[PDB]
Amino acid sequence: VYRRFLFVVFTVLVLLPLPIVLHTKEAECAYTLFVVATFWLTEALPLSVTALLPSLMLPMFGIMPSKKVASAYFKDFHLLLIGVICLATSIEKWNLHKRIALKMVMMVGVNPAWLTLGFMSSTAFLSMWLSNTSTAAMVMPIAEAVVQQIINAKGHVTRKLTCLCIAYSSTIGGLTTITGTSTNLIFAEYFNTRYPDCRCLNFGSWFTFSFPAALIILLLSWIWLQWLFLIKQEYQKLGPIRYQEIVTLVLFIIMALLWFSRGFATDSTVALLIGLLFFLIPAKTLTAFDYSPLITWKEFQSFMPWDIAILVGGGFALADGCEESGLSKWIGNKLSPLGSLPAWLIILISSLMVTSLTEVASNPATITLFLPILSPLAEAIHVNPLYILIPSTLCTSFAFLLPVANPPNAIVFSYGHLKVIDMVKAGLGVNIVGVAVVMLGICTWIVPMFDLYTYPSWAPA
Amino acid sequence: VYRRFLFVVFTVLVLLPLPIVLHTKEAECAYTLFVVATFWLTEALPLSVTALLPSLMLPMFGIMPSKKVASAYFKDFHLLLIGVICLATSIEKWNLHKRIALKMVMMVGVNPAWLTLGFMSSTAFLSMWLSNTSTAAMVMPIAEAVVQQIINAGHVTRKLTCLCIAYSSTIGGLTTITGTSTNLIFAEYFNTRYPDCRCLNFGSWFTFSFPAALIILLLSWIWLQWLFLGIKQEYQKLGPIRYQEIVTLVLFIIMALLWFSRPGFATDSTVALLIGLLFFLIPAKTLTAFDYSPLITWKEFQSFMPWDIAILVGGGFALADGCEESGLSKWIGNKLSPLGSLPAWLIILISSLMVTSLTEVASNPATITLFLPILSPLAEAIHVNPLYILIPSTLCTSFAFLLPVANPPNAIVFSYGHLKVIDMVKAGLGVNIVGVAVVMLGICTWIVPMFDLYTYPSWAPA
Ligand SMILES: CC(C)CCC[C@@H](C)[C@H]1CC[C@H]2[C@@H]3CC=C4C[C@@H](O)CC[C@]4(C)[C@H]3CC[C@]12C
Ligand SMILES: CC(C)CCC[C@@H](C)[C@H]1CC[C@H]2[C@@H]3CC=C4C[C@@H](O)CC[C@]4(C)[C@H]3CC[C@]12C
Ligand code: NA
Ligand code: NA
């Protein structure tokens, strides 16, 4: 009774017994550690309120920030993210993302079973640019209407096979771009901090090592999903193609051709030069007296992730706060026999610990907690840091079990079908295929790309 | 004909004849100067798109950023602004700001002419916390309904009440560093460039400017009432006082009592985050039940927070440092060497009158962004305290009281029926001269013993 308020009686709870430790300087900093890590996993607070808590609690105990090295008022990853969001804002303001999801399904829709590959290929291409949650929330109304008019010409299992294709291929196409999922932005913001001399990570080199990785997972999970389970009038009611979709489509082909083919030759120059045209090209008249452009600043501010910059800096103030106190030395002495395992065994034992924790917690929470653990470990045992951080930001996205992990597969669970055991039987095939393909990747073709066997010059010592 | 598109045929225009200069390294950097300054004043682009233009154009010519000194992932002014916005988010989500605007008018509403002072005192107190544009857009529906039921018991009392809402929303917009938006561009420019100064917080901006605005508020009521003329049922239809307004009002008195009365946790940004982050936690609604919702959500907080101020400041720094890497700051620095022979007080009068005149035709964040990296190099060169010049120029930026294109407070009240354009010029020139004279009286007598304005400090370089 009265456990409809289980957020407030838990946040107020956790701060009460945890002040057993009030005794020294490392016990007070470990109090901030087990509180912010607790509210990130259970998500009792909205994940950026919690990132402001080390900026409040640590000066109260007497642990002040002391880092004083930065540069560059506008960073290069911040200007790439500006130009990508303003392309992804007008592509769904003007409903261009339903033309493509219908035209791709129509082309390869011979449908013995090529409808399923038609649905996966249409929502994995849309996840490279849009967010995973917003692109699964519009193919799912489309696919439910198509599969109802097909059965209006056995029928139960083809409704929950089509459900899992939308939820799983929105995540597989969520990688292959550093701006596809949100957890590819926390990796890229942690890496341009802490390692600001590294120039090996841009838009056109994340796509080259991960598009061969996801095409194998996409083609092998279609075969797995189709195994264990078994429209011209829908495109006609979108209307004719408008003016504001031809302009958006032309700037989308122009921008993506220069990213892969190309001090002004950086990828953040193409993002701002073609991205800032969306604030300029006229779209509507509003009688006339004054036009309106393709996107406005109030719509751009709605789509931009501002909470990622608070989440990264809140993870840095917690990590540096453990270094000023004696906590990083104290647990560093009890874990000295960890540096006797081989380099490949650290990869397998960590990527299986991240692909298992991401099923019960959100993906930006488990990439924020684990990324300042593996990167000190990689410099200590004299490994290239990208050799450990690349297969852990890729196995974070592999959240394919029970529908509390990522909000893609909680949308498709909100429909009628697809009880919980249908995800565990289907997700364990895509999970094992996903881990084995990335483990195959960092042994053969990723190593000659980023020079993963040679300790670089951006790592300290 | 076809000049309904005068934005796109002007932005595309200005970039065409201005590449006469393509010849050297300072001529290419002055090309970026006269483009970004042109789109800030005319506002052909939304004022943060333009701040990203020196981050695009300057690496193309070969002028790279080279500054490498900062600290402190979260700054102290950023944590004060977080806690203020989440108090100003729930105060208008739950309509607490109409209780106060009606209860203050009701109390001093004897109305021979105390209705006018009742309206100014209710919308100047609400501008210390809310934004100037959003607090003039809700007293103006209220005052038009009250002045219509008073005349139903007459033309010049409709446009006297209009100008009280537009002018006292700006006078109460100062006295807080988070009241207007141009008090945030001053405070963000000053914690950059001068990071050793600890003299500027919430509780010392209010002490030097609340005596400055109370004199301008009390003297412009006398001026406005002169040149123009010599409600329990409106409060009853708000309903009874709810649950979510008593909780917001209690945390508003708690937070403001500790700001003025108070190892390293005794700062003003601690009170802002400790009482501000309770608005994400206290339950407000049930939504059947199975899961409550708090007083404010993160999607509503993200809507009210000014994110474009941090882009506008860093875009002004990349343009200012870009002129220093090239030879432009030395080239115009040699042609302006006889400027450093005027007295210290004459620089104040000649600059505050140049900023209070330009802010009538351009927006206030555009004229504080262009002028703040001009006066602060000038104050270090002629050996003056930099706060002695920057304080009376961030205060005369807000004095936009003439024709209704200056600030969006007095374009809202112009959008109603009354108040033709000459009624603002006759009324605004009285509030303008009173405003400049009170700040000039302030920086001579009581502001100087507060910030030590005659002694060159230790945070300025040399
Ligand atoms: C973000 C928060 C958790 C930082 C605190 C993380 C602790 C767990 C991290 C910080 C420092 C890390 C240690 C850095 C140093 C060493 C010594 C090396 O031979 C083994 C790795 C080991 C032992 C790392 C283990 C993990 C570690 C101790
Ligand atoms: C933001 C942009 C405009 C920066 C370029 C501004 C130019 C106008 C600013 C930058 C440097 C400034 C100069 C700094 C040095 C001097 C020499 C001193 O005896 C007179 C002031 C004077 C001459 C300043 C005048 C204004 C100035 C030249
Ligand atoms: Na995505
Ligand atoms: Na205000």
Residue numbers in the entry:
A (entry chain B): 9 to 161, 232 to 308, 333 to 364, 381 to 405, 415 to 588
B (entry chain A): 9 to 161, 233 to 309, 333 to 364, 380 to 405, 415 to 588
Anything the authors wrote about it?
NaS1 and NaDC1 regulate sulfate homeostasis and oxidative metabolism, respectively. The rest TMDs form the core domain that is responsible for substrate recognition and conformational change to complete the transport cycle.
In the structure of NaS1_IN/IN (top), sulfate stabilization relies on the side chains of Ser139 and Thr141 from HPin, as well as Thr259 and Ser260 of L5. The sodium density proposed to be bound around L10 and HPout is not found in cryo-EM map density. A notable variation is observed in Ser260 of NaS1, which is corresponding to the Pro201 in VcINDY, Gly288 in NaCT, and Ala241 in NaDC1 of L5, where Ser260 in NaS1 could potentially preclude citrate and succinate binding. (A) Cholesterol binding stabilizes the inward-open conformation of NaS1.
